[PDB]
Design a protein around this ligand. Sequence first.
Ligand SMILES: C[C@@H]1O[C@H](O)[C@@H](O)[C@H](O)[C@@H]1O
Ligand SMILES: C[C@@H]1O[C@H](O)[C@@H](O)[C@H](O)[C@@H]1O
Ligand SMILES: C[C@@H]1O[C@H](O)[C@@H](O)[C@H](O)[C@@H]1O
Ligand SMILES: C[C@@H]1O[C@H](O)[C@@H](O)[C@H](O)[C@@H]1O
Lengths: 314, 315
Amino acid sequence: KPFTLPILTLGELTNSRFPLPIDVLYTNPNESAIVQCQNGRCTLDGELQGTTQLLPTGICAFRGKVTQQVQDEHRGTHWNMTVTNLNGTPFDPTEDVPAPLGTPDFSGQIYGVISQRNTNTVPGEGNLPANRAHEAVIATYSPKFTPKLGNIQFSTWETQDVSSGQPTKFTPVGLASVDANSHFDQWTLPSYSGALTLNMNLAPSVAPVFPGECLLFFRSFIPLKGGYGNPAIDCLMPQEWVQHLYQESAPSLSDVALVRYVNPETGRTLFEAKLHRNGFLTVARNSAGPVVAPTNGYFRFDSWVNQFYTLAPM
Amino acid sequence: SKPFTLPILTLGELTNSRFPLPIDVLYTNPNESAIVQCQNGRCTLDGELQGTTQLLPTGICAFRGKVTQQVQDEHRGTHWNMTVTNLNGTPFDPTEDVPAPLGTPDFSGQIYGVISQRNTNTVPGEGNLPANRAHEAVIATYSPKFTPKLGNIQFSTWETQDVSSGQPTKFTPVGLASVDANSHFDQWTLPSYSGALTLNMNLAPSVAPVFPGECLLFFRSFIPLKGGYGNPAIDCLMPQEWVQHLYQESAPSLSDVALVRYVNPETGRTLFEAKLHRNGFLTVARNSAGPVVAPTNGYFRFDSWVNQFYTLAPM
Ligand SMILES: C[C@@H]1O[C@H](O)[C@@H](O)[C@H](O)[C@@H]1O
Ligand SMILES: C[C@@H]1O[C@H](O)[C@@H](O)[C@H](O)[C@@H]1O
Ligand SMILES: C[C@@H]1O[C@H](O)[C@@H](O)[C@H](O)[C@@H]1O
Ligand SMILES: C[C@@H]1O[C@H](O)[C@@H](O)[C@H](O)[C@@H]1O
């Protein structure tokens, strides 16, 4: 079965690491961190890895139940919630995954909305349940962030109106802050089972091997609740590529696919890239920053090549 | 002729094309009195997007634009006029043959979400990272001030001051503010995209069974509530992944109807069959309302092109 990529353009792609559209292609050759994100991880023959799942609505989402308000040194009102799988089934910590699929894969203060729909109903209210929603923050670097253990903590501005024991949804929206105390680092993984524990079942780190090459990312700018900043989240492949590869399950005929970024209006190749078996792109570029190209551009699979292939410089 | 196909995503792997929600259940309601004419999640089987449908899951019920004015409510809350662009940031051209900017909500109600802003500019001499803010907001799509086809809408906030004019603004939808009587939630009533006395234009057509004994089959999602009582749902004709797939493939439609079977892969058994109509919606032979009780690892498989006169096996 022939390997293919979707023919979605850049303006028709979304980030696999946060629910955002792709804004630009981006490189950063001098990156010192190990790149080992856990969402947006899929091999070219369709094997999902890390915490990657298929739903755009599941990325950095949680489902579960609030148990109780809990004490925390930091500003706000804090709440513990058990978390299930996104489909509502109990999370089984013995599954070979780092954490429930969809769990955030970076250090930071994730801002979103917690909403609840009660299980019990009121006969006087048409046998309909009570609801509430409030803004919430999840500090993924907190020692109380333990999604692999089945529970996490979030904070609210709201001091009282979060109910215990009721079905709870977290809808991510952006970051609370990128100030010095907010520990935003997109390449630092959370400790999924808590402080001082080793993460397990990780999707592998990715890196260029060939001289002169660097990773190419699909970059999205992420909203902020407050403060100064222009934070971004870079994914290895957009969510639509995860979904496509998973569907197709095309055998990988070598370790490296040659892809061409094409202008469909003109037919011209803007640049070429290596698409590696584990699901990431490299290019021959010696600079950091956006790739300035039209958003109607798209990657086209050309052929299977190998580690010895020399890319034309961007 | 390029063969027609559906994605092999299961129900637990599909999302709603009318609001950013996972699909929860398949659903019928034969006795529905409203005309079904939603504008998001509209795609022909040969890949033609219709209505306000676009491809991004992040674009559904999203807005992009700039705030122009603050207006305090008589009683409570603050209203903000917002001039909207296309989601890709280019100016919205109202003479474009669409009902409204792609992604515009397609139903009456109070849509609850978060408005966020990232300022364009920084203060000369004063540090070079832009200022940001986000607050909860509500968009009343039934409001006379909801005129996205004219290039502007209004949202309201609890926040009374901290929303900036002339700065890039994003609306991230989250759910509904209310489903009380005064909140006018009706998923099949279209907004008046240009205001109340003006006719909507360039609409995707209404959908309905033709053949006796059939009813529409929907992909149903439950939508969060900011407050109050209720368990509101949003029904789409096809999930967003089917829109994306059909658009990609652009397979010619070889009859008016693609016969599809909902299959249990564990047993290989067909649970039921359905008609997938050329204009992009499903019907089944069912004479009851409510969820279809089936495993979420079940999925629709294309069987063959049939005629509109084909008689469905009763569900
Ligand atoms: C819920 C809280 O209300 C306050 O007025 C705001 O200043 C906070 O940002 C937050 O939204
Ligand atoms: C930089 C400042 O951060 C705060 O959270 C906001 O409320 C202000 O509007 C401003 O953007
Ligand atoms: C921003 C507003 O703050 C208040 O405390 C809340 O009661 C409202 O629901 C809203 O969130
Ligand atoms: C029914 C009530 O509606 C309000 O908005 C909520 O704040 C309460 O928690 C409760 O759900």
